[PDB]
Symmetry: C3
Subunit: 70 residues, 3 copies
């Protein structure tokens, strides 16, 4: 039971990690399309993207560190 729960936590984190890598790709796609515009809130959007990207990366790192905190 205890090992199964831990194993499930490990599985969930990996799904989250894979979700994030999948998020990184979607962000690239939007920024690539936005770069075509030569002629509106993107500068604030850019900062929020950087904001939550870092926050997620820390939470993933924190989750990884928790695996050895027993």
């Amino acid at each position: 039971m205890a090992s199964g729960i831990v194993q499930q936590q490990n599985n969930l984190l990996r799904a989250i990690e894979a979700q994030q890598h999948l998020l990184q790709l979607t962000v690239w796609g939007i920024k690539q399309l936005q770069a075509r515009i030569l002629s509106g809130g993107w500068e604030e959007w850019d900062k929020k993207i950087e904001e939550y990207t870092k926050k997620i990366e820390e939470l993933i790192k924190k989750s990884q560190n928790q695996q050895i905190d027993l």
Copy 2:
């Protein structure tokens, strides 16, 4: 250590919350680019809202139960 397992459940949830914020930022980005146009987009709005409502419900459920732990 069952003090870490509760903590790890909290960590995953927070990561999920933050990834939901990032997802919503991507939705805004798509809608911005889409607004520069002029099928699908009306239905796309409906399904974006639908699953956003579904995620927000599951997060609330997970948050409350995180406290019961």
Copy 3:
């Protein structure tokens, strides 16, 4: 801290991840639709990598489902 409580919540986290995955696939649809308007380069490789990780997380989701049943 009942073990059934953690297991219960792990089910929700999994359901949340599954729902967020469906939301993400809806965003991929939106991007590809806008990208299709380009007639002028990363996008062929972008498709390959969206494809690669979509399958990868789906494996992890399926693996999480079968673990959830073993709990």
